[PDB]
């Protein structure tokens, strides 16, 4: 089985890592639109066209399924992409909704959605959760987390101050935190730590990881038993910084 | 004269404002490639191509001269753009070098260049300054300044912490600081306040503004109001910003 993975850049690596461990596919074609990253600060119209152009990139690769690892693209371009695509396209939003549905029985549990400005503004998460019966939903566009993470500021006073900037205004004790952005898993522990040290939470909140969530979904939906190639063929492509992207793949994914 | 102004997005407003105040042109065609901003975080080969493509946008407008308000595009794509352009293309780097020549007589004056990662790695300013005889040139990529400014983090603890993160490691105290990025003028007084508050200085460092520098050059070189906005991203948003901040 040969599939594709699309993201605005290298961020999607966080989703790809999960996919690789789950041995769901024998071959993966990763494509990052690095020349235009980030997507999170842009509008729906622009994002949708980006999504459509991504489909064009994959046509020669003859993939049988496309994973939109980008949360922003999943929120703004997924519907349009699915409209014209002949192969199934799976985003990272619905899988997380289902993940929450399975592990969060209390419909009143306070849920906090974190993502880019575009993702949050879209209310993609909020709407899906409401449809599933959840009644305590809060969202925050922690936009600066993206560039900080890209500069590798994964700890220290600057990150702490940035988290403080976004989280201080919160008047809820989150029991569930959605890491609704490809970049957020890289500071998940820091985020959990902030809430445990700045709030009176009795126990750490449940963190929803987009990659683990989509893995769960794919296994069930497509009846995949984790028996694909052990050392799968993976290609990395991008609209820019491709040499760099390949280096990142070897350095962090050992591919 | 009818001219064009190019930037990766809305940032070029810092230059457009200077142009407008100087009442130099009868008509201006502003284009921000907001679908792909930022340029500063990307590699040179990508930025150069972005610049060439920008030229195509202005062709039907029949502009007489093009201003590249973007410091990053000025640093990386200007040479290539001028190669394939018949109309003059003026960037924001050389004009600043000239201003510095006029305002900084002391060749040993410590000069600090601030800009995007791409602009700083190009050594555009350093090379130009070296060529003109300056002996104490420093540079620093204050990358996070761009997104902080776009999110309107123009004061407070977060900006202070970010400036500290970038400035603390400096060993040389600048007497002159070049705001080599469209966004930096929005935190000019804060950058000024940082050095005045962290060191004992009788007078703040001289800040060089890209917009003011290019206005002087244009008046000089060209012995020198309809304004329309275009964008690869949300043009309506850009026009709304123009109405709010430029009253246009
Ligand atoms: C699959 C990842 C969990 C692996 N990984 C890290 O574990 N860790 C710990 C990483 O640090 C890492 C990095 C990394 C490399 C250089 N600078 C910042 C991050 N990168 C590349 C990278 C680059 C930019 C943004 C990214 C956003 C989301 C995932 C990866 C990103 N990958 C990293
Ligand atoms: C720079 C001045 C001509 C106008 N101006 C402000 O004075 N001031 C004080 C502004 O705040 C300003 C703003 C602004 C609007 C919304 N959020 C942040 C900044 N904007 C729009 C804007 C947006 C993003 C990045 C920009 C980078 C450089 C210049 C302007 C930018 N313009 C602002
Ligand atoms: N990939 C984006 C983050 C980076 C961007 O804004 O392009 C997301 O998951 O929302
Ligand atoms: N216009 C850029 C800043 C924004 C970007 O990186 O594109 C500059 O002047 O360097």
Residues B122, B95: Cα–Cα separation, whole Å: 17
- Residue B147: CB atoms within 10 A of its CB come to 22
- B13-21 vs B235-245: helix crossing angle, rounded to 10: 40
Among A178, A181, A238, A249, which one carries the catalytic annotation? A181
The answer to whether B159 and B192 are in contact (CB under 8 A) is no
Candidates A223, A189, A236, A235; CA nearest to A209 is A189
Judged by its nearest atom, the ligand closest to the C-alpha of residue B15 is 2
Cβ distance of A147 and B150 shorter than 8 Å:
no
The answer to whether B5 and B64 are in contact (CB under 8 A) is no
The answer to whether A17 and A211 are in contact (CB under 8 A) is yes
The answer to whether B137 and B106 are in contact (CB under 8 A) is no
Cβ distance of B151 and A144 shorter than 8 Å:
yes
- Residue B188: CB atoms within 10 A of its CB come to 14
* DSSP β-bridge partners for residue A90: A67
Which chain B residues are Cβ-neighbours of A164 within 8 angstroms? Answer: 157
What 8-state DSSP symbol labels residue A105? Answer: -
Ligand 3 pocket, mutate which of A34, A183, A214 (most atoms under 8 A from CB): A183
Tokens of B57: 């946008």
- Write out the DSSP string of chain B: -EEEEEESSGGGHHHHHHHHHTT--SEEEEEE-TTT---TTS-HHHHHHHHHHHHHHHGGGT-SEEEE--HHHHHHTHHHHHHT-SS-EEESSHHHHHHHHHH---TTS-EEEEE-HHHHHHTHHHHHHHHTT---EEEEE-TTHHHHHHTT--SSHHHHHHHHHHHTT--SPPSEEEEESTTGGGGHHHHHHHHHHHS--SSPPEEEEHHHHHHHHHHHHT---EEEEEESS-HHHHHHHHHHHT--
The answer to whether B15 and B5 are in contact (CB under 8 A) is yes
A12 is in an annotated binding site: no
The answer to whether B166 and B113 are in contact (CB under 8 A) is no
**Gyration radius of chain A over CA positions:** 18
When CB atoms are compared, the residue of A42, A157, A162 closest to B35 is: A42
When CB atoms are compared, the residue of B150, B158, B165 closest to A41 is: B150
Residues B200, B218: Cα–Cα separation, whole Å: 37
Residues A6, A10: Cα–Cα separation, whole Å: 10
* Ligand 4 pocket residue status of B72, Cβ below 6 Å: yes
- Write out the DSSP string of A17-66: HHHHHTT--SEEEEEE-TTT---TTS-HHHHHHHHHHHHHHHGGG--S-E
CATH number among 3.40.50.1860, 3.40.50.740, 3.10.20.90, 3.40.50.720, domain A1-91+210-255: 3.40.50.1860
Residues B141, B71: Cα–Cα separation, whole Å: 13
Local structure of A5: helix, strand or coil: strand
What 8-state DSSP symbol labels residue A86? Answer: S
What 8-state DSSP symbol labels residue A119? Answer: H
CA A154 to each of CA A150, A163, B114, B168: distance values in angstroms, whole numbers, following the listed order: 9, 11, 23, 19
The answer to whether A101 and A42 are in contact (CB under 8 A) is no
- Closest Cα of chain A to B73: distance in Å? 14
CA dihedral angle for residue A199, residue A197, residue A185, residue A19, rounded to 10 degrees? -90
CA A181 to each of CA A92, A213, B240: distance values in angstroms, whole numbers, following the listed order: 9, 13, 28
Does B162 qualify as catalytic in the annotation?
no
The CATH code of the domain at B1-91+210-248 is 3.40.50.1860
B203 is in an annotated binding site: no
* Ligand 3 pocket residue status of A211, Cβ below 6 Å: no
Cβ distance of A35 and B41 shorter than 8 Å:
no
What 8-state DSSP symbol labels residue A78? Answer: H
**Region(s) of chain B under CATH 3.40.50.1860:** 1-91+210-248, 92-209
**Residues in CB range of A174: below 8 A, 6 or more apart:** A110, A111, A112, A138, A195, A201, A205
Element (DSSP H or E) covering residue A239: none
**Method used experimentally:** X-ray
- Residue B153: CB atoms within 10 A of its CB come to 19
B84 is in an annotated binding site: no
When CB atoms are compared, the residue of A146, A153, A161 closest to B158 is: A161
Which chain B residues are Cβ-neighbours of A148 within 8 angstroms? Answer: 144
The answer to whether B131 and B87 are in contact (CB under 8 A) is no
Cβ distance of A240 and B43 shorter than 8 Å:
yes
Residues B225, B17: Cα–Cα separation, whole Å: 13
Candidates A50, A174, A185; CA nearest to A109 is A174
CA B24 to each of CA B18, B38, B110: distance values in angstroms, whole numbers, following the listed order: 10, 28, 33
Residue A150 CA, ligand 3 centroid: distance in Å: 11
Indicate if the alpha-carbon torsion angle B232, B233, B236, B242 is positive or negative: negative
Among B181, B187, B208, B215, which one carries the catalytic annotation? B181
CATH classification of B92-209 is 3.40.50.1860, yes or no? yes
């Amino acid at each position: 089985m040969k599939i594709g993975v699309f993201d605005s850049g290298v961020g999607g690596f966080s989703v790809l890592k999960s996919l690789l461990k789950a041995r769901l596919f024998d071959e993966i074609i990763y494509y990052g639109d690095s020349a235009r990253v980030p997507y999170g600060t842009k509008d729906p119209t622009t994002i949708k066209q980006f999504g459509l152009e991504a489909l064009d990139f994959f046509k020669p690769h003859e993939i049988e399924l496309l994973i939109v690892a980008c949360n922003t693209a999943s929120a703004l371009a997924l519907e349009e992409m699915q409209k014209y695509s002949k192969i199934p396209i799976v985003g990272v939003i619905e899988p997380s909704i289902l993940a929450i549905k399975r592990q969060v029985e209390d419909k009143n549990a306070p849920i906090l959605v974190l993502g880019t400005k575009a993702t949050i503004q879209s209310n993609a998460y909020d709407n899906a959760l409401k449809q599933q019966g959840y009644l305590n939903i809060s969202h925050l566009a922690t936009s600066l987390f993206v560039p900080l993470i890209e500069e590798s500021i994964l700890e220290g006073e600057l990150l702490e101050t940035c988290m403080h900037y976004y989280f201080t205004p919160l008047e809820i004790l989150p029991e569930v935190i959605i890491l609704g952005c490809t970049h957020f898993p890289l500071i998940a522990q820091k985020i959990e730590g902030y809430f445990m040290g700045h709030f009176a939470l009795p126990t750490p909140p449940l963190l929803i990881h987009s990659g683990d969530a989509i893995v769960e979904y794919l296994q069930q939906k497509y009846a995949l038993k984790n028996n694909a190639c052990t050392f799968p063929k993976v290609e990395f492509h991008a609209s820019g910084d491709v040499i760099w992207l390949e280096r990142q793949a070897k350095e962090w994914l050992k591919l």
